Amino acid sequence: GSHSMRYFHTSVSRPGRGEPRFITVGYVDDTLFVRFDSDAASPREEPRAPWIEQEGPEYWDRETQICKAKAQTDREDLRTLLRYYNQSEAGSHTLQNMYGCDVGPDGRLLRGYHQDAYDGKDYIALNEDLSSWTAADTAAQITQRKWEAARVAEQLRAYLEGECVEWLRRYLENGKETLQRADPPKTHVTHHPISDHEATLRCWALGFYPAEITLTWQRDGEDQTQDTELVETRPAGDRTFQKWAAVVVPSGEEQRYTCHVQHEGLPKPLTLRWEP
């Protein structure tokens, strides 16, 4: 279908406890494929999916060099940000970066991304045009001015339209067994008495990939979304995900309620009921 690639990066300063901790991971869709952690013995970027293992030594060398360089850039930038925000050197702070690209079924660029956050809030983002910036505040405007002067947006555009798309396409082909397979949810409804008067109906979806799914309850064909407890989609630890949706219902009225499941792995939406 459509596909995405993303690289995520987090640096966390720890004054008095050495250099910042730096962790970066890469994903294609909802599949982790590479990782780097600065607090490994002698750190290297490492494979986390079978289809990336075939890349040669030069790939891993280059990736590792980039990861180490990013860590060092972040280390300096954390110091810079204490100046920009008139902060003391005493506390731990966080820099996060994401970048990557989305492609359509034909493999053409749909959207590119590059965005940074300080202390868990937006700092500066490349706009969808891959040409202009959104700065969150007057500190980030200082960054924006430097990046405009250095024509950074144009450099990112060249990567995002070029290598990002080209390498995503390579990974999708090499990983076609898994990246191009949707596993449908295994579904069922359970019943959990609360009293003689009422009970929870819980609609389960298990073992699905990718993570995107919709689960809803209806009563007599009307959505119950204000009354539905819907847990966050959660990883099973293989490659698959889990989710459930629950409604509290009066005793004897269970057959009024239907659960509806949409997922890319399913031909048509499912409709399910409690089956005693």
Partner: peptide, 9 residues
Amino acid sequence: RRKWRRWHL
């Protein structure tokens, strides 16, 4: 694969 270039804040 990752980008080669980056720039200080």
